Amino acid sequence: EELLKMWGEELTSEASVFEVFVLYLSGEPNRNGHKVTCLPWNDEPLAAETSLLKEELLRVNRQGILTINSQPNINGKPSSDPIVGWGPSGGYVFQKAYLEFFTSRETAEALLQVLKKYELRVNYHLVNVKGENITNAPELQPNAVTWGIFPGREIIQPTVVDPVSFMFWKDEAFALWIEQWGKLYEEESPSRTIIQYIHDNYFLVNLVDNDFPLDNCLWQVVEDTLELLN
Amino acid sequence: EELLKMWGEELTSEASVFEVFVLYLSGEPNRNGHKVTCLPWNDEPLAAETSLLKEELLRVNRQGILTINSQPNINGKPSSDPIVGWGPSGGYVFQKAYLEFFTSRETAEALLQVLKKYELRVNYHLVNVKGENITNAPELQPNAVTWGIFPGREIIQPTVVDPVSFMFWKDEAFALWIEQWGKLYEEESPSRTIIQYIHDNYFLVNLVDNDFPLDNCLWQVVEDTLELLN
Ligand SMILES: Nc1ncnc2c1ncn2[C@@H]1O[C@H](CSCC[C@H](N)C(=O)O)[C@@H](O)[C@H]1O
Ligand SMILES: Nc1ncnc2c1ncn2[C@@H]1O[C@H](CSCC[C@H](N)C(=O)O)[C@@H](O)[C@H]1O
Numbered sequence: 113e114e115l116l117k118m119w120g121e122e123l124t125s126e127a128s129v130f131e132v133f134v135l136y137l138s139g140e141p142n143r144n145g146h147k148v149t150c151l152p153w154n155d156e157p158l159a160a161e162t163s164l165l166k167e168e169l170l171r172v173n174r175q176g177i178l179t180i181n182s183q184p185n186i187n188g189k190p191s192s193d194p195i196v197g198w199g200p201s202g203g204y205v206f207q208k209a210y211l212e213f214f215t216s217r218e219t220a221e222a223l224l225q226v227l228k229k230y231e232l233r234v235n236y237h238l239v240n241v242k243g244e245n246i247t248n249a250p251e252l253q254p255n256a257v258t259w260g261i262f263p264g265r266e267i268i269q270p271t272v273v274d275p276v277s278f279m280f281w282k283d284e285a286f287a288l289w290i291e292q293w294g295k296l297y298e299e300e301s302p303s304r305t306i307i308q309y310i311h312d313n314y315f316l317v318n319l320v321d322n323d324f325p326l327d328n329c330l331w332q333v334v335e336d337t338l339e340l341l342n
Numbered sequence: 343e344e345l346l347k348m349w350g351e352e353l354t355s356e357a358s359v360f361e362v363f364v365l366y367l368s369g370e371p372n373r374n375g376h377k378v379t380c381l382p383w384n385d386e387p388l389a390a391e392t393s394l395l396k397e398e399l400l401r402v403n404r405q406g407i408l409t410i411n412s413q414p415n416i417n418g419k420p421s422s423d424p425i426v427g428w429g430p431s432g433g434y435v436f437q438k439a440y441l442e443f444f445t446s447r448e449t450a451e452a453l454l455q456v457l458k459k460y461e462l463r464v465n466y467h468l469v470n471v472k473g474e475n476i477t478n479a480p481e482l483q484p485n486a487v488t489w490g491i492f493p494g495r496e497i498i499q500p501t502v503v504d505p506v507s508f509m510f511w512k513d514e515a516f517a518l519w520i521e522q523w524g525k526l527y528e529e530e531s532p533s534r535t536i537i538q539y540i541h542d543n544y545f546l547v548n549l550v551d552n553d554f555p556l557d558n559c560l561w562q563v564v565e566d567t568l569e570l571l572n
Contacts, residue, residue: 233493265484266485266499
């Protein structure tokens with residue numbers, strides 16, 4: 113009853129879903145006065161590194177690019193930074209920019225068309241519930257996205273985007289629609305209709321911008337998809 | 343006969359050894375008109391990254407800090423750079439500054455005294471033929487000194503300074519004096535005296551500055567040792 117109170121008692125349209133993600137990312141309550149304190153993929157409030165890319169995420173989600181995971185790029189910041197720092201003291205820490213999101217088939221086709229402009233810079237991975245796995249991943253090999261350099265030590269790379277492990281995550285990612293939000297609504301409801309439509313027709317998408325020394329391209333990539341579509 | 347022609351037919355003093363290293367590092371011939379084209383540890387001309395730190399090495403060796411291996415610090419330069427670049431195209435490549443050298447016991451004690459000022463920033467390792475291994479190495483663990491970040495890929499760290507492997511290199515490093523320069527001179531020669539003295543009384547020393555984003559400290563560390571000594 114508390115989940116169904118924050119995610120809306122009944123969805124009017126896709127817009128309702130778009131708002132549930134925008135109200136998770138902003139601090140604002142819905143029209144009923146309740147904050148979206150979690151989503152099926154998160155169960156938590158955001159980690160503090162998202163403070164670096166909040167407005168951007170607001171803008172992206174307001175369009176229907178439904179982000180479920182993210183990362184700022186970090187260019188060798190002090191390992192003591194309370195926002196991004198980790199590991200032993202006196203080192204440096206690094207990140208690639210990363211974005212994980214669901215999309216409509218229409219927006220997925222517009223994104224595949226725009227990713228031709230960014231092919232070598234951005235690793236991408238689109239998939240849907242029937243398969244149709246599309247990725248530019250080198251030989252289906254991991255991509256490092258977080259690492260740290262520490263005094264007297266080897267490099268530590270704690271975090272990766274593996275195209276093989278993503279295909280096990282896919283099975284959670286799409287089933288968390290029906291199993292935790294669909295089964296929350298009535299069987300025959302237009303709400304269930306909406307959620308079953310999103311369970312079937314949407315693409316899960318992952319992007320990684322490999323140029324961590326530069327400004328993040330992923331926001332311009334999505335602006336370029338909304339240009340092409342609009 | 344060709345080695346003994348370039349390393350000098352007979353050493354007057356330690357100064358003679360100091361000059362053989364300075365004439366390896368500069369392009370200049372000795373007083374006899376012959377270039378030092380190699381040393382016992384190298385068998386080759388320098389790699390092009392030394393162009394970035396030549397004058398510095400000239401200055402260091404002119405004092406008796408006999409460098410046998412070195413590296414500039416590199417802060418995420420294009421992986422396509424003909425000087426420093428390596429691996430797949432479109433990535434970034436990184437280095438810590440590194441210096442490997444022999445020293446007199448007097449200069450080794452002056453360096454141990456000055457390394458107290460740089461303790462956390464500079465990894466150091468001194469050793470001599472009897473043992474007397476001194477290092478600040480974390481739990482006797484490797485230190486990364488070269489690495490690269492490439493699109494779609496994990497980090498590659500091709501090059502390390504391992505405090506355990508250094509103790510196998512030690513046995514070459516000191517024996518290459520007697521086995522390739524000492525046995526080049528006569529048995530009873532003052533030249534053999536000189537080389538046996540350097541085979542026994544000198545310390546092999548390795549330093550690594552871990553702050554690759556900053557200007558290299560190692561040159562000021564050696565200036566600080568020549569201040570203390572002088
Ligand atoms: N709905 C959502 N949209 C965008 N980002 C989200 C999100 N829910 C969680 N996140 C973010 O996803 C990230 C998980 S942590 C990612 C790993 C970490 N940056 C590393 O350094 O290895 C956090 O920043 C979290 O705030
Ligand atoms: N006598 C000497 N003094 C100082 N440096 C030397 C030297 N003889 C060789 N070198 C240097 O030692 C280095 C060996 S290559 C070191 C590894 C490489 N920089 C990496 O990126 O992993 C070369 O730069 C070479 O020019």
